[PDB]
Amino acid sequence: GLSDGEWQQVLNVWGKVEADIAGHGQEVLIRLFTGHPETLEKFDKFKHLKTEAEMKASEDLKKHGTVVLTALGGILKKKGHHEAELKPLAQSHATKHKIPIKYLEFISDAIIHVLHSKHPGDFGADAQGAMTKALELFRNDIAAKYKELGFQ
Ligand code: HEM
C-alpha cells in the first residue's frame, strides 16, 4: 500500500525508464542473469548465452527486456489496481514458466541496482523507498496467487 506521494515518485522514476525502455530492460535482465545464473536456466531461448558480452549483443534479450518492462510499467501505472494485469502473469509464471517467487525478489533488487547505475545521484532516497515498496507490492500480490496455485 503506497501513498499518492509515493506513487508520484514511482511514476517519476519510471519516466527515466521510459526514455530508454530497451536499454533499461536489457541491463535489468543482464544484472539478473549474472547476479543469479540459475535464473538463466528458466529461459530456453537465453540458456545458450554463456558470456555477458553475448548477453549485451543479444537483440532478442533487449527485445524481451522491452516486453518485461512494458508489462511492469503497465502494472505500475495502475497504482496498485492491477488485478487484471497481474493475474495472467502470476498464472503463466507459476504454471508455464515455473518461476519461484525468490527470482522475483532477485529481479526487484536488480531493478534498484540498474536505476542507481544508470542514474547515479539522480535516484534519491525517497525515490528508492517508493520504487522498493512498489516492487514489494507487485511481488506480494504474485505470491498470493502462487499460494492459491500451491506453487513452490
Ligand atoms: C518484473 C517482473 C517480471 C515481469 C513484468 C515479467 C513479464 C513477462 C511477460 C510479459 C512475459 C511474456 C508473456 C508471458 O509469458 O506471460 C514473460 C515471459 C517469461 N518470463 Fe517473465 N516477467 C518478470 C519476471 C521474470 C523472472 C524473474 C523470470 C525468471 C527468472 C521470468 C521468466 C520468464 C520466462 C522464462 C518467460 C518466457 C520466455 C519465452 O520463452 O518467451 N520472468 N515475462
Side-chain angles (χ1 to χ4, degrees), residues 29-150:
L29 287 183
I30 290 177
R31 175 60 186 177
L32 180 72
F33 294 158
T34 65
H36 310 275
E38 70 273 31
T39 56
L40 191 56
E41 295 311 303
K42 293 288 184 174
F43 299 81
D44 284 353
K45 74 178 189 176
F46 297 136
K47 52 178 180 58
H48 69 99
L49 292 175
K50 303 186 178 179
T51 75
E52 177 167 352
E54 293 170 348
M55 294 184 189
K56 217 85 188 60
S58 173
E59 301 295 342
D60 197 48
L61 188 159
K62 192 196 282 186
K63 183 177 176 180
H64 197 64
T66 296
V67 166
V68 170
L69 286 195
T70 294
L72 178 56
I75 284 165
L76 292 174
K77 275 164 180 170
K78 298 299 296 282
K79 298 206 306 182
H81 292 61
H82 54 224
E83 170 77 11
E85 288 74 17
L86 191 146
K87 186 181 182 179
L89 282 183
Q91 288 196 346
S92 67
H93 286 59
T95 62
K96 190 174 210 308
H97 309 320
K98 326 275 190 171
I99 306 304
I101 192 91
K102 187 69 168 179
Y103 295 3
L104 299 170
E105 175 189 345
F106 289 167
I107 200 174
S108 291
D109 286 339
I111 290 169
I112 296 293
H113 192 277
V114 175
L115 290 174
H116 276 300
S117 174
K118 291 189 77 57
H119 313 277
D122 203 31
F123 189 29
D126 49 343
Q128 182 182 149
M131 189 57 48
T132 297
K133 288 185 68 171
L135 295 173
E136 287 177 340
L137 180 63
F138 170 76
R139 200 152 75 243
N140 194 60
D141 281 352
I142 297 189
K145 308 286 184 177
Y146 277 27
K147 185 172 174 290
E148 190 175 319
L149 302 171

